[PDB]
Amino acid sequence: HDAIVPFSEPKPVTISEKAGVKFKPLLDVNTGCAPYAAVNAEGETSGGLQTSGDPESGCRGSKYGSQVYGRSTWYNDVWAIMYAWYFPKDSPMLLMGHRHDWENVVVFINDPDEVEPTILGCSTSWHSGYIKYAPCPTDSINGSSVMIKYEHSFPLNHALNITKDAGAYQDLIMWHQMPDLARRALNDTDFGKAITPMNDLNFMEKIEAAWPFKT
Ligand SMILES: *[C@@H]1O[C@H](CO)[C@@H](O[C@@H]2O[C@H](CO)[C@@H](O[C@@H]3O[C@H](CO)[C@@H](O)[C@H](O)[C@@H]3O)[C@H](O)[C@H]2NC(C)=O)[C@H](O)[C@H]1NC(C)=O
Ligand SMILES: *[C@@H]1O[C@H](CO)[C@@H](O[C@@H]2O[C@H](CO)[C@@H](O[C@@H]3O[C@H](CO)[C@@H](O)[C@H](O)[C@@H]3O)[C@H](O)[C@H]2NC(C)=O)[C@H](O)[C@H]1NC(C)=O
Ligand SMILES: *[C@@H]1O[C@H](CO)[C@@H](O)[C@H](O)[C@H]1NC(C)=O
C-alpha cells in the first residue's frame, strides 16, 4: 500500500518537455481517490486497493506525493498533449466499482514552439470515451492550465470533465523521461478494468478518439 515512489519532474529542455510543463492541467478531486504514482523506476507497479464502503479510504494522498503522466505528438497538424492520472481504486457509493483507475485529458494547442501557444481544444476521459471541447472554454483555462474535475455521478463510476474550480498540480513525468523498466511495466501490466492510456499500445488510438474538432 502506497509503496510506489514517484519520479521527480526534470527541468525541461526540449520543445515538447517545455510545453508539457507549461500546459499541465489543474486537477480538482471530488469524493474519490487522490492520484497516486502507478510505477517506479525499478518497474514495480501499484497493487491498487480493493473496493470498499468508502470512496476515499486508504487513498487520500501518498506519503510520497503524487504524479501526472504526459505524452505528446503532432496529430493532424495540431499538437496534442495527453495528461494521465492513476488512482488506486474507483469505488463510488451505491456502485460496485473496481480496483485501479486511469483517467486522462488531451489538450490540443497550435504549436509548442511559440512563445505563447494557443489552446485550441481539450477532451476529458469519460468511461473509455471522451467529452470533447472545441474550443476549450475560456472559463476553464487558468493561464495555460485547463481546469479538470474528477468526480462521479450515479449511476456511473468516476470520470473527468472541465470545471471552473481550481485544483492542484502534480509532478509531471513525460513518457520518454521514464526509464525503460517503467515503460516496459506500463506497456505490459494488467490493471484490470483500467487501461493505461499513454502506453505504446493505446496512446495513438486514444489521441484519435480524443480529436474534438469539427472536421
Ligand atoms: C461536462 O461539463 C460541462 C461543463 O460544465 C457540462 O455542461 C453544463 O451542464 C449544465 C447542466 O447542469 C448547464 O448548466 C446551466 O444550468 C442552469 C441551472 O439552472 C440551467 O437553467 C441552464 O439552462 C444551463 O443549462 C451548462 O450550461 C452546461 N455547459 C455547457 C458548456 O454545456 C456537462 O453537462 C458535463 N457533462 C457531464 C457528462 O457531466
Ligand atoms: C513497451 O515499452 C518497452 C520498454 O521501452 C518495450 O520493451 C523494449 O523494446 C524491445 C521489445 O521488442 C526490446 O528490445 C529487444 O530485445 C530482445 C532481447 O534482448 C532482442 O532480441 C531484440 O533484438 C530487441 O533488441 C527491449 O529489450 C525492451 N526492453 C524491456 C525492458 O522490455 C516494448 O517494446 C514496448 N511495447 C510495445 C508494445 O511497444
Ligand atoms: C488559478 O489557479 C490558482 C492555483 O494554481 C488559483 O489559486 C487561482 O484561484 C486560479 N484562478 C482562476 C481565475 O481560476
Author numbering: 28 to 242
Which text from the study accompanies this structure?
Necrosis and ethylene inducing peptide 1 (Nep1)-like proteins (NLPs) are widely distributed among prokaryotic and eukaryotic organisms, like fungi, bacteria and oomycetes, and may infect a range of different crops, such as potato, tomato, soybean and tobacco, thus posing major threat to agriculture worldwide. It was shown that NLPs function as cytolytic toxins that induce plasma membrane leakage by binding to plant membrane sphingolipid receptor. NLPs share a conserved necrosis inducing protein (NPP1) domain, typically containing the heptapeptide motif, GHRHDWE, which is crucial for toxicity. The aim of the current study was to provide structural and functional information on similarities and differences between non-toxic HaNLP3 and toxic NLPPya, both members of the oomycete type 1 NLP group.
To investigate structural differences between non-toxic HaNLP3 and toxic NLPs, the HaNLP3 crystal structure was determined. The HaNLP3 structure comprises a nine-stranded β-sandwich flanked by three α-helices. The structure of HaNLP3 is defined in electron density from residue His28 to residue Thr242, and is thus missing 27 N-terminal and 5 C-terminal residues. Three glycosylated sites were observed at Asn169, Asn188 and Asn214. In addition, two bound phosphate ions were observed, likely due to the crystallization conditions. All amino acid residues involved in Mg2+ binding in NLPPya are preserved in HaNLP3 except for Asp158, which is also important for glucosamine binding in NLPPya and is replaced by Asn184 in HaNLP3. However, no metal ion is present in the HaNLP3 crevice. HaNLP3 Asn184 is involved in phosphate positioning, which is however mainly contributed to by the side chains of His125 and His154. Comparison of NLPPya protein surfaces in the apo- and hexose-bound states with HaNLP3 reveals that the crevice of HaNLP3 appears to be in a more closed state than the cavity of apo-NLPPya. Furthermore, HaNLP3 contains a second disulfide bond unlike NLPPya, which could play a part in HaNLP3 rigidity when interacting with the membrane.
